């Protein structure tokens, strides 16, 4: 058994219209611990019919949830926030168990996840409209914002709590309802957040958590007329399909998709700080975050020193079961993740790169953090996301050249650069074709800043003063009056 302070947090059922249900046909998905292969439990594999019932239940709850005051919805969301915080350790263990990441990371994610609920509880009261000077006398112009309505979220495995709250928080705050389908590999964290949602007083049908086959559930959420808005985080390939599948009813859509993050270290970097930044943006979550450094570009002058410093740190990383003290790298999520990191390694080396450390299988789903030197733009890793604990170090000579290579991608989520020079900070931060830029830091994640991509990395933003509008419609009211 998992050693949970509150064992009622671990669920084998879906949350549908305020009840916990199995699949009509009793079919299930096993959830296995990537550290040891042990079966944690099962979750339902819901049918389309049941998904349709969840959608009806969402539409039925919408009226009353939307008709509450912003202050009432905010009080309920703040209770949910407080409940998550009070149960952080349990939730962290569930997550580490199903996802792999070490408990300290899991715990960090829980607090981060919780912060969007807090932040959007506060935003709910700050959904401001406008009055606008009228071009004609005898008219008054107003703009109000109202909830889009029933909404759907589809979320990935790499951040099993935080990708959920980033969508459910602003949606519920705005007065919308939401149905969430968490990834098959990591549904238990979502279910636990659902237990606490119910305990918080989020009424029946406002929030629903459904598990089952991605394609069938995804196709119903995007074809059902009642759903007015989809938010998805995951691969670009699936994002492209979902946008197409929304087109017949012109659904509002938000997408956070693939990246190919460059991480640029200039000769006048604080080099030690650049090393610490690379370590956190490359090796957090075993390299499996959307914003992870994928390509580390280091200027000729500091290349050898940077590589040598990074090796000293990579060599100290403890790999193992996430519940074990001192482990900072967990197992990878699935075997095909390992194959891909291997293919990246083997391609680079066959093109002349040197695997200077690690990058080896350690048994089961465990993989050793590693570094390549001599990496160039003709290698696979230049164009494709590794999604694993591999640091490819690309030499460069000039700022122009690095900016050109950094932007030479269909993606545009996150980028990072280190420099102490004021002017270059301006040029490079502006020239980078990315939604998010870390300057002198590898950790850019919070709830107060808008998160998202340009180009093929997605649509819309999460967090911040800009997040809630993804779940609102703007209404212009033009009123004539007798003067």
Q: 101 vs 228, which CB is nearer to a second copy?
A: 228
Q: Cβ of 249: how many Cβ atoms within 10 Å? A: 13
The span from the CA of 312 to the CA of 310, in Å, is 5
The owner of tokens 């939401």 is 178
Tokens of 87: 């149960």
Nearest approach, Cβ of 435 to a second copy (angstroms)? 6
Nearest approach, Cβ of 395 to a second copy (angstroms)? 24
CB 185 within 8 A of CB 211: no
Q: Cβ of 139: how many Cβ atoms within 10 Å? A: 12
Query: Can you say whether the dihedral through the CA atoms of 419, 423, 424, 429 is positive or negative?
Result: positive
Q: 24 vs 477, which CB is nearer to a second copy?
A: 477
Nearest approach, Cβ of 188 to a second copy (angstroms)? 28
Q: 359 vs 438, which CB is nearer to a second copy?
A: 438
* Residue 448 three-state SS: coil
Nearest approach, Cβ of 299 to a second copy (angstroms)? 16
Whole-Å CA distances, 321 to 33, 66, 88, 103, 332: 10, 44, 19, 10, 11
Catalytic annotation present for 399: no
The span from the CA of 76 to the CA of 86, in Å, is 15
The span from the CA of 89 to the CA of 457, in Å, is 32
Q: 93 vs 200, which CB is nearer to a second copy?
A: 200
Q: 12 vs 440, which CB is nearer to a second copy?
A: 440
Nearest approach, Cβ of 289 to a second copy (angstroms)? 15
Q: Which of 98, 256, 447, 462 is catalytic?
A: 256
Which among 165, 204, 205, 202 is positioned nearest to 182, based on CA atoms? Answer: 165
The catalytic residue positions are 256
């Amino acid at each position: 058994m998992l050693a949970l302070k509150d064992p009622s947090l671990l669920k084998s059922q879906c949350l549908v219209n305020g009840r916990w249900i199995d699949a009509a046909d009793g079919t299930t998905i096993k959830v296995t611990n990537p550290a040891d292969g042990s079966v944690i439990g099962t979750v339902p594999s819901l049918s389309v019919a049941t998904i349709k019932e969840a959608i009806d239940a969402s539409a039925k709850a919408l009226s009353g949830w939307a008709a509450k005051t912003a202050k009432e919805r905010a009080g309920i969301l703040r209770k949910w926030f407080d409940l998550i915080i009070a149960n952080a350790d349990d939730i962290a263990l569930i997550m580490t168990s199903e996802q792999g990441k070490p408990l300290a990371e899991a715990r960090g994610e829980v607090l981060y996840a919780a912060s969007f609920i807090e932040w959007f509880a506060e935003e709910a009261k700050r959904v401001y409209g406008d009055t606008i000077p009228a071009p004609q006398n005898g008219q008054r112009l107003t703009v109000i914002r109202q909830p889009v309505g029933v909404t759907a979220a589809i979320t990935p495995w790499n951040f099993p709590a935080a990708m959920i709250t980033r969508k459910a928080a602003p949606a519920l705050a705005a007065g919308c309802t939401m149905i969430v389908r968490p990834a098959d590999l990591t549904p238990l964290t979502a279910l636990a957040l659902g237990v606490l949602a119910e305990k918080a007083g989020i009424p029946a049908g406002v929030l629903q958590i459904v598990t089952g086959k991605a394609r069938e559930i995804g196709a119903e959420l995007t074809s059902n007329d009642t759903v007015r808005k989809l938010s998805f985080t995951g691969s670009t390939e699936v994002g492209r399909l979902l946008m197409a599948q929304c087109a017949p009813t012109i659904k509002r859509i938000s997408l956070e998709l693939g990246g190919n993050a460059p991480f640029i270290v200039f000769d006048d970097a604080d080099l030690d700080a650049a090393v610490d930044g690379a370590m956190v943006s490359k090796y957090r979550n075993a390299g499996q975050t959307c914003v992870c450094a994928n390509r580390i570009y280091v200027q000729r002058g500091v290349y050898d020193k940077f590589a040598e410093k990074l090796a000293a740190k990579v060599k100290e990383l403890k790999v193992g079961n996430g519940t074990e003290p001192g482990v900072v790298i967990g197992p990878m999520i699935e075997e095909k993740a390992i194959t891909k990191v291997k293919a990246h390694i083997e391609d680079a080396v066959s093109k002349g790169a040197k695997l200077i450390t690690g990058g080896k299988e350690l048994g089961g789903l465990f993989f050793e953090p590693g570094i390549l030197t001599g990496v160039t733009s003709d290698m696979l890793v230049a164009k494709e996301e590794t999604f694993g604990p591999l640091a490819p170090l690309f030499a460069f000579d000039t700022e122009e050249e690095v900016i050109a290579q950094a932007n030479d991608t269909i993606f545009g989520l996150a980028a990072y650069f280190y420099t102490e020079n004021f002017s270059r900070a301006i040029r490079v931060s502006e020239a980078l074709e990315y939604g998010m830029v870390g300057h002198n830091t590898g950790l850019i994640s919070n709830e107060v800043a808008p998160f998202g991509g340009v180009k093929q990395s997605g649509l819309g933003r999460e967090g911040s003063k800009y997040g809630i509008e993804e779940y609102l419609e703007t209404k212009y009211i033009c009123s004539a009056y007798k003067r």
